[PDB]
């Protein structure tokens, strides 16, 4: 099994010893330190993170095939902005070309994960078809002087859609059929993105020096860009389909062929609802929402909330639980003990992975902890509370401490208050010293 | 404080810069044995250049695209030639070998614009030419856009020359042409350097 080892080579290059890191928190201490020597105290050796318990996918409300079936035979390939917009609805997702991928020429997605489109339901998806050549496919991406990169739609980071382009020499013409789509070059009245205003105005009056001195705003050009057919190798066509995926409130009409799995509450799952995916724990709405804000991504670029594609509920999704591994361990001049504080959890869900694993026993090599002490910094496993306190030894936090005093295991044993197994306790502030005002 | 305007220039004579031969797509040949016209004392035609918003390479250094209208030049040379796809790839600096340096390179230090696009006019004389020769080594370190005829050999060897001969024992006299569709990457393209 691929596990990290801290290997020791002698003079000869001969491996004489090694520590298997993903064995016991003590081995993690040594792997963290990069030494076989551990000194008395507490180390951060790793972190525990709950692993996914389920991958929830959803099946459509209506089964049909998506009508992609007419636009790769022969159809309209309008402009680069005005698109052969075909509505996709009421079907089993045929977004499956992104899911298993192709090879593409353009594979740029924003707002949706392309590889999980068969998990993710949509309300409406528009398939926007056009054909463009090499020198124009480059203009999809921002920046670089061009004729379409510099106007209107590029592919912004906040785009809800995927741009799919691949190498095919099938399908030419029919792009120049646009004339009810025109927008300004020179303007005095501003330019709003993607205007369909074919207007009427006339002037010879410029802004900068005009009329014989190569001025600006001396003309009123209008523009709407198509595609040039391939007239030599190098003018290579590519077929581009842009999928505009509606993540907005409405019941889902399109999802993948995979069988519905319903919501699994208070377990770590892989989720993907209304464009919002990630690894997290599903619950239901406690947060206030506007009907226009029924899904959220926070400043951290993670899911905050999402509206459910099949039900009418808004879900609150909080990323899966994790916490520090703080190991209480002595020196290596004495037998080693391992008590682990599982940062900021209760002592009822103490597993490393809850209803999941890391291809290793539920804890790490154990499937149970034992000696579970609920502290004010999390839950301490491998140490039990005793009613015999000290003015601390190894501090844990929040008045909680442990001590190891060659007690033939102290943070690796059950509690006694009648024998030397004085392990973990709330610290005392010394003793009282009697005095009275006189 | 932000600007509201730029300073505008105009030459002292109204003649259009004779960019003619290069425009009418003629006399593109060799890669050193250029058709070079010196352009001076005239009105530039680069407004339309930046506005053509085209080209596979539009690689400028020292001059300013979309601001070329106010940008005056002391000497403009238009050098027209045909080189293959693979040579066009290698125009930018930091190529493989010191043998790339003298194949064709236009450094990022070199001031000018590299205009290259997918046009395939004119095929012959890209190595057929007799005025197309260059040096690899010279004891006075020949640098690009320079040609000469020499009696004297730069001979150093990676293994000492005569009896035993390593690399750089050559008479460093080169020219390379190409024959397209006899392999791949040998497709001609037109390139203009301003």
């Amino acid at each position, epitope marked *: 099994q691929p596990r990290t080892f801290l290997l020791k080579y002698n003079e000869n290059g001969t491996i004489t010893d090694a520590v298997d890191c993903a064995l016991d928190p003590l081995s993690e201490t040594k792997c963290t330190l990069k030494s076989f020597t551990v000194e008395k105290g507490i180390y951060q050796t790793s972190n525990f993170r709950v692993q996914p318990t389920e991958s929830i996918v959803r099946f459509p409300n209506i089964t049909n095939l998506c009508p992609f079936g007419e636009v790769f035979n022969a159809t309209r390939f309008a*402009s680069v902005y005005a698109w052969n917009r075909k509505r996709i609805s009421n079907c089993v997702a045929d977004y499956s070309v992104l899911y298993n991928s192709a090879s593409f020429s353009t594979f740029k997605c924003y707002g949706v994960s392309p590889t999980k489109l068969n998990d993710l339901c949509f309300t409406n998806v528009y398939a926007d078809s056009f054909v463009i050549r090499g020198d124009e496919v480059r203009q999809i991406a921002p920046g670089q002087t061009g*004729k379409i990169a510099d106007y209107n739609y590029k592919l912004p980071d906040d785009f809800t859609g995927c741009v799919i382009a691949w190498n095919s020499n099938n399908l030419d013409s029919k*792009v*120049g*059929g*646009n*004339y009810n789509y*025109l927008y300004r*070059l020179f303007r005095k009245s501003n330019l709003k993105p993607f205007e369909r205003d*074919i*207007s*009427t*105005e*006339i*002037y*010879q009056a410029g802004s900068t020096p005009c*009329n*014989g001195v*190569e001025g600006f705003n*001396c*003309y*009123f*050009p*209008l*523009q*709407s*860009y*198509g*595609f*040039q*057919p391939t*007239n030599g190798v190098g003018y290579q066509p590519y077929r581009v389909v842009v999928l505009s995926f509606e993540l907005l409130h409405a019941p889902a009409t399109v999802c993948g062929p995979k069988k519905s799995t319903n919501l699994v509450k208070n377990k770590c799952v892989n989720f993907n609802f209304n464009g919002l995916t990630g690894t997290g724990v599903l619950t239901e709405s406690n947060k206030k929402f506007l009907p226009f804000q029924q899904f959220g991504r926070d400043i951290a670029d993670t899911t905050d909330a999402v509206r459910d594609p099949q039900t009418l509920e808004i879900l609150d999704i909080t990323p899966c639980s994790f916490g520090g591994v703080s190991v209480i361990t002595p020196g290596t001049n004495t037998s080693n003990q391992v008590a682990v504080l599982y940062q900021d959890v209760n002592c009822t869900e103490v597993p490393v992975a809850i209803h999941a694993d890391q291809l290793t026993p539920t804890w790490r090599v154990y499937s149970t902890g034992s000696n579970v002490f609920q502290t004010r910094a999390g839950c301490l496993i491998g140490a039990e509370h005793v009613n015999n306190s000290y003015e601390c030894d190894i501090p844990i936090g929040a008045g909680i401490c442990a001590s190891y005093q060659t007690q033939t295991n102290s943070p690796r044993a059950a509690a006694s208050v009648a024998s030397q197994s004085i392990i973990a306790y709330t610290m005392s502030l010394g003793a009282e010293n009697s005095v009275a005002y006189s | 404080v932000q600007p509201t305007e730029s300073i505008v220039r105009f030459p002292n004579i109204t003649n*259009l*810069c004779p*960019f*003619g031969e*290069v*425009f*009418n*797509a003629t006399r593109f040949a060799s890669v050193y044995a250029w058709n070079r016209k010196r352009i001076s004392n005239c*009105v530039a*035609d*680069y*407004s*339309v*250049l930046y*506005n*053509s*918003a*085209s*080209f596979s390479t539009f690689k400028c250094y020292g001059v300013s695209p979309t601001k070329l209208n106010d940008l005056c030049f002391t000497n403009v040379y*238009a050098d027209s030639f045909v080189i293959r796809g693979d040579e066009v790839r290698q125009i930018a600096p930091g190529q493989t070998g010191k043998i790339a340096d003298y194949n064709y390179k236009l450094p990022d230090d070199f001031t000018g614009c590299v*205009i290259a*696009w997918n*046009s395939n006019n004119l095929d012959s004389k890209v190595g057929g030419n007799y005025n197309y020769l260059y040096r690899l080594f010279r004891k006075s370190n020949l640098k690009p856009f320079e040609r000469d005829i020499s009696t004297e050999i730069y001979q150093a060897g990676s293994t000492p020359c005569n009896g035993v001969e390593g690399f750089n024992c050559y008479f460093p006299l080169q020219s390379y042409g190409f024959q397209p569709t006899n392999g791949v990457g040998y497709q001609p393209y037109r390139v*203009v350097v*301003l």
Partner: nanobody
Amino acid sequence: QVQLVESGGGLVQAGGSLRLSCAASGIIFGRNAMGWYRQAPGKERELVAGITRRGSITYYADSVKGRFTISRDNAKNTVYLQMNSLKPEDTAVYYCAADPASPAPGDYWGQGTQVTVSS
């Protein structure tokens, strides 16, 4: 853009009209219409005139005037370019292309056409 297809031109007289035809890539074809660029060794390359789709309204610079008209028939989906009230000053090499952008001096758009007026 490049590799524009044109017909017409040659020798015409001052006055009258000359109608040119052109067809082109979606990049040119789909824009306002196709207007005119012209140059001559005694004339700087300039954008002459254009249109904002068919109407009574067309536009032209005061550097070069003429109530030029641009139109599209439906009989054949091409662009007809008509220059009205020509003068000898109009002898130039013409290119029939849309008003945005402009041919580079380091490029050459289609074949072009030559128009000469009364010469």
